[PDB]
Design a protein around this ligand. Structure first.
Ligand SMILES: NS(=O)(=O)c1ccc(CCN(C(=O)CCl)[C@@H](C(=O)NCc2ccccc2)c2ccccc2)cc1
Ligand SMILES: [Zn+2]
Length: 258
């Protein structure tokens, strides 16, 4: 009886094994655009992905992760609300069964079709396992997906999904450029939060881009052909792998833009 996104093991149950689920800095949250305040002290975000070295794509039974070589600083996130250097380790998505749901963060209660998380760890803590034990250990760059025009830079990801249909499958995924997943603008919202899956650790500085990327209906339909289950088990389509918005509590969401 492991955690997941079913009726019996979904987000409303997680608190029994992970009591931090009811904590003071849980993610995701609703972003109320009329309450978020422009902070002139923030900086321009620095997304440096030119030298990124992707290695593998894995179906972990919850999502699919594109993993990077993090054994040196190549692909790094700096600036914005961040002190120091955060190394890109993986990206993944959350998505829905239909286009009207799928994002984790919401914007004035609007749910997008999906959300991309680019996960980075603070290199002052030496390894990612040490970083997640710290309040400033991770930085997650969140990007909304809406359905419209295809995203060219997403198609290489779409086309390998058939090879990792079930939990525990992986495939070689070298030479993928994550720059192809970004919108034009780097305008963002930021707040202190958590991992959105167990173990729900309160170690994340969230940076959520205001501008969504457009993907095609055919692109997200292929996400929805993935399976939660392992090979040889009853098919459970990988859909609705999102946690809903959590209470904001004693937190402020800051805007990078006026
Ligand atoms: N939805 S969210 O963005 O809030 C979120 C939720 C959970 C996590 C932790 C996610 N995670 C695991 O769960 C265990 Cl596989 C770790 C992970 O992806 N590791 C893959 C990897 C390992 C070694 C080198 C390169 C890549 C792992 C462990 C520590 C830091 C980063 C990744 C990350 C992000
Ligand atoms: Zn995520």
């Amino acid at each position: 009886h492991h955690w997941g996104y079913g009726k019996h093991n979904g987000p409303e149950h997680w608190h029994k094994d992970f009591p931090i689920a009811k904590g003071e800095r849980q993610s995701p949250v609703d972003i109320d655009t009329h309450t978020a305040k422009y902070d002139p002290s923030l900086k321009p975000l620095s997304v440096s992905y030119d030298q990124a070295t992707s290695l593998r794509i894995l179906n972990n039974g919850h999502a699919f992760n594109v993993e990077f070589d993090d054994s040196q600083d190549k692909a790094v996130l700096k600036g914005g609300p961040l002190d120091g250097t955060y190394r890109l380790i993986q990206f993944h998505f959350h998505w829905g069964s239909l286009d009207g749901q799928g994002s984790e963060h919401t914007v004035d209660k609007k749910k997008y079709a999906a959300e991309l998380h680019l996960v980075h760890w603070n290199t002052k803590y030496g390894d990612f396992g040490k970083a997640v034990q710290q309040p400033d250990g991770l930085a997650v760059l969140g990007i909304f997906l809406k359905v419209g025009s295809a995203k060219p830079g997403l198609q290489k990801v779409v086309d390998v999904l058939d090879s990792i249909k079930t939990k525990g499958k992986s495939a070689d995924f070298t030479n993928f450029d994550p720059r192809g997943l970004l919108p034009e603008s780097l305008d963002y919202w930021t707040y202190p939060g958590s991992l959105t899956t167990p173990p729900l650790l309160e170690c994340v500085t969230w940076i959520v881009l205001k501008e969504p990327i457009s993907v095609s209906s055919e692109q997200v339909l292929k996400f929805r052909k993935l399976n939660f289950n392992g090979e040889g088990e009853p098919e459970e389509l990988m859909v609705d792998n999102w946690r809903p918005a959590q209470p904001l509590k004693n937190r402020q969401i800051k805007a990078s833009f006026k």
